[PDB]
Amino acid sequence: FRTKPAPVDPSLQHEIEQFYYWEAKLLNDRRFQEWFDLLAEDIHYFMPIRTTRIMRETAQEYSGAREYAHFDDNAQMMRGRLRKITSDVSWSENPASRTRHVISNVMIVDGEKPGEYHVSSVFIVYRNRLERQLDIFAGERKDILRRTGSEAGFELAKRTILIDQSTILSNNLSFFF
C-alpha cells in the first residue's frame, strides 16, 4: 500500500467486502466459534501500542516486532481466548457486550503467493454494554487473506490493527477487532 493499489476486478472487491461484512456479523452477533474458524493455523493477530511523537520521530509511533502490544497472538493463544469468551464465568463478556463493526474503505492488492491478498480497511467499532457504557473506537485493519475451500471462501492469515488511540479509552479490550 505504499503506492495506490492497481485496479482490481469489481467481482473481487465485492467478494472480499462480503467476507468482511460476514465477519462483522459473526463478531457482532456473538457467533464466536464461527469467527475463530475463519482464522488460519498461522494467524498472527497483532495490535501494536501507539504513542504520540513529534514529527521528526513518527518512525517510533508504533511498537515494533519484539515489543509490548495490546494484542500479538498466534493460533494457540487465540484458541485460549475462544475458550474464555464462550464461558459462563467470563465476566467481561457475560453479560455480553453489544458491538458494531462498521467496515469501509476496502482496498485490495495481490499477494506474493497466489490465493493471498493484502487488504486495508477502516472501521468504527461501537461497544455498548451494561446500562450505559459506550466506547467508540476507530482504525485501520491491514490484513492478509488467503483463499480456502470453505463457505467463507477465505481464512485470515495476518491482521494488524492500527488503532486511532494512544491511551486506550476503554476499561478493557474484551472483544475482537
Binding site: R66, E67, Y68, D72, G80, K84, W91, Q133, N171, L173
Partner: protein, 425 residues
C-alpha cells in the same frame, strides 16, 4: 474534613471500611497533597531511558512529569509545566532530545529542566534570575532498575520508604547479577474506578484470584492451597504468594515461564542470591503493592503505576520486565504471555476492569455509601516473628495487608508533614 473524621473511616481493629473513601472529592484533593505529593511513586525502569537525552512522560498524581536521562547518567524528574504561563513543556510521550522549548512563548530548557533562555531577556526581563524559574524538581532514586520519584525533601530515602518490602520485591528484581530490563512498550488505559481498589488488590487480594474473578482466565490457559501474605511493619506495602504448587502459574504464564521460574540454572541462581530454595523456586503467582500506587506480580513479571484521575477514575500504565541475561526465547515468551494475561485485553485483567467499574458506579448511590465494607478476613491470625519472612505474616487468603494499606492511608491523610508521619512508627 477533619483528622478525626478521617480516622473513623477506617477500622483495622474490627475490620471496616467506609465506602466514601472511594468517592469523596474533598478526600481526593487531600490525597493528592498528603499522599501523592509526598510518597515515592514509580516513574518506570532505568533501561527505558538508557541514553543521554532519553525521556518519557509520567504522572505523580495528576501532575505530569518529565523523566529524562542526563549527560552524567543522572535521571531527573520535573513537572511538565513552564512557569511562565503554564504550557506543557513537551507533548510527546518519549524520544531523545538535546533540549526542550515551550511552544507558547519560547522559554528554553536543558534536558534537566533548568531554564537556560528567555526570548528578549535583556529588555523584557532585566532582573530575571532564570535559575529560580525552572519547573519543580522531584527527588529521584532507583531500586534494582525501578525509578521512583517524590516531591518532598523531608520524606525518607527510597531504601527506608521501602524498608523490609525490599525482601519481597527481590523475588523479581534481584534474581541475577545482571539485573532486570524492561521490554519496550507501555500500555496505558482508562478504568473508571478509585485507585485504592487496584492498589489494594495487588497488596492483599489473592482471595479474588483463588475464587471467581478469574475462573475464565485459568480456563483459557488450560488444554491451590498453601501460601503466606506479608503486611509491612509500617508504610502500607503488602505482598502475597502461593508456595509449592506450580499448577496455577502454569495456566497463567504457560510451561516455558513456569520451568524458567522453578527449575534449571536460572532458578537455582535465584535461590542462591536469596538464600532460600523456597524463595527462588517454590513461589507461585506473587502479587505486590509498594504503597500507594506501585503494583507488580513477581513471576508473571508485569509491573504498573496506577494514576488517579479524581475518585471515580484511574489510568493503568503497565509494562513487562525480564531478567536481562535470560535467553531471547524467554524474553519473547514473557512478552506474549504477559500481554495475553495482564493487560487491557488480557484474559485475566479484562475481568478486573469490568468488576472495578461496576463497584464505582454502584457507589453513586446513597445507601451504597452509608454502610461499611467488610475488611475482617484474617483478623488476629498473624505472626510478626516468622524466622524466614520479615514483617507481619498471615495466610495467603487474608485482608491483613489491605488493612495495613488503609491504615497507612489514614496516617498520611492525617499527618501535616513527614515529622508527624514518622511519629506513628
Amino acid at each position: 474534613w477533619a483528622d478525626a473524621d478521617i480516622a473513623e473511616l477506617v477500622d483495622e481493629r474490627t475490620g471496616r471500611l467506609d465506602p466514601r473513601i472511594y468517592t469523596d472529592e474533598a478526600l481526593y484533593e487531600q490525597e493528592l497533597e498528603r499522599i501523592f505529593g509526598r510518597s515515592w511513586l514509580l516513574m518506570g525502569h532505568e533501561t527505558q531511558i538508557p541514553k543521554a537525552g532519553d525521556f518519557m512522560t509520567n504522572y505523580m498524581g495528576e501532575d505530569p512529569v518529565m523523566v529524562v536521562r542526563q549527560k552524567n547518567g543522572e535521571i531527573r524528574v520535573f513537572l511538565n509545566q513552564c512557569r511562565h504561563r503554564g504550557m506543557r513543556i513537551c507533548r510527546a510521550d518519549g524520544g531523545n532530545a538535546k533540549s526542550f522549548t515551550c511552544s507558547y512563548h519560547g522559554w528554553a530548557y536543558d534536558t534537566g529542566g533548568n531554564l537556560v533562555s528567555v526570548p528578549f531577556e535583556e529588555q523584557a526581563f532585566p532582573g530575571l534570575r532564570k535559575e529560580d524559574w525552572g519547573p519543580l524538581q522531584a527527588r529521584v532514586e532507583t531500586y534494582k532498575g525501578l525509578i521512583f520519584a517524590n516531591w518532598d525533601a523531608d520524606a525518607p530515602d527510597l531504601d527506608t520508604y521501602l524498608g523490609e518490602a525490599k525482601f519481597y520485591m527481590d523475588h523479581m528484581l534481584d534474581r541475577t547479577e545482571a539485573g532486570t530490563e524492561a521490554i519496550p512498550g507501555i500500555q496505558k488505559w482508562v478504568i473508571p474506578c478509585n485507585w485504592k481498589f487496584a492498589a489494594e488488590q495487588f497488596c492483599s487480594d489473592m482471595y479474588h484470584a483463588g475464587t471467581t474473578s478469574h475462573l475464565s482466565g485459568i480456563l483459557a490457559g488450560l488444554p491451590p492451597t498453601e501460601g503466606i501474605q506479608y503486611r509491612a511493619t509500617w508504610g502500607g506495602h503488602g505482598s502475597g504468594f502461593y508456595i509449592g504448587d506450580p499448577n496455577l502459574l502454569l495456566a497463567i504464564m504457560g510451561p516455558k515461564v513456569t520451568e524458567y521460574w522453578t527449575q534449571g540454572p536460572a532458578a537455582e541462581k535465584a535461590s542462591e542470591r536469596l538464600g532460600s530454595t523456597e524463595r527462588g523456586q517454590q513461589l507461585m503467582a506473587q502479587h505486590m503493592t509498594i504503597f500507594p500506587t506501585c503494583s507488580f506480580l513477581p513471576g508473571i513479571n508485569t509491573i504498573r503505576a496506577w494514576h488517579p484521575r479524581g475518585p471515580n477514575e484511574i489510568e493503568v500504565w503497565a509494562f513487562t520486565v525480564v531478567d536481562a541475561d535470560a535467553p531471547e526465547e524467554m524474553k519473547e515468551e514473557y512478552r506474549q504471555q504477559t500481554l495475553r494475561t495482564f493487560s487491557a485485553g488480557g484474559v485475566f485483567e479484562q475481568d478486573d476492569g469490568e468488576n472495578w467499574v461496576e463497584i464505582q458506579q454502584v457507589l453513586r448511590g446513597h445507601k451504597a455509601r452509608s454502610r461499611p465494607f467488610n475488611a475482617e478476613m484474617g483478623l488476629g491470625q498473624t505472626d510478626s516473628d516468622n524466622p524466614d519472612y520479615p514483617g507481619t505474616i498471615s495466610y495467603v487468603y487474608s485482608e491483613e495487608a489491605a488493612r495495613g494499606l488503609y491504615t497507612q492511608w489514614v496516617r498520611m491523610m492525617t499527618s501535616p508533614d513527614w515529622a508527624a508521619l514518622d511519629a506513628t512508627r
